[PDB]
Amino acid sequence: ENIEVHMLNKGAEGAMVFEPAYIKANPGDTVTFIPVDKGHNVESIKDMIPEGAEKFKSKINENYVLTVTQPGAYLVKCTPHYAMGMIALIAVGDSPANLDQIVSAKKPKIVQERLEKVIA
């Protein structure tokens, strides 16, 4: 199946958000990122994607289709706006083995805060 995500300047959660910021998927599903507003992209955060998943980085203002294979959690950011908290969590399969590790990982306070709301 395909899950559609919008990249926006402002959304329910504040400025610079992925909608939805919590994406539940299964191996083989696609995640389509659509920059509704300009100045956004999607990029995998180093060490915040499952063991064996490939790193990715879309072009700014480009529609981007990600195919998810490896089960586990993925924390993706917007390159330009990561520091303002523009992130999304992709959970592939049940009880992602690396979820606790991602929650614990070093990241900007703003990011960490949103991560906490998205998980809740």
Binding site as annotated, residues for Cu cation: 40, 78, 81, 86
> With CB under 5 A as the contact rule, which of the stretches 49-57, 76-84, 90-98, 112-120 interacts with Cu ion?
76-84
Distance (Å, whole) CA 52 – CA 22:
21
Least separation in angstroms between residue 113's CB and Cu ion is 17
Q: Which of 31, 42, 75, 78 binds Cu ion (CB under 5 A)?
A: 78
- Compute the least distance from the CB of residue 110 to Cu ion, in Å: 13
In the complex, least distance from residue 109 CB atom to Cu ion, rounded to whole angstroms:
18
Q: Which stretch binds Cu ion (CB under 5 A): 23-31, 42-50, 58-66, 86-94?
A: 86-94
* Range 5-64, binding Cu ion (CB under 5 A): 40
Binding site residue list = 40, 78, 81, 86
DSSP string, the chain: -EEEEEEEEEETTEEEEEESSEEEE-TT-EEEEEESSSS---EEPTTSS-TTPPP-BPPTT--EEEE--S-EEEEEE-TTTGGGT-EEEEEESSS-TTHHHHHHS---HHHHHHHHHHH-
- Residues in contact with Cu ion by CB under 5 A are 40, 78, 81, 86
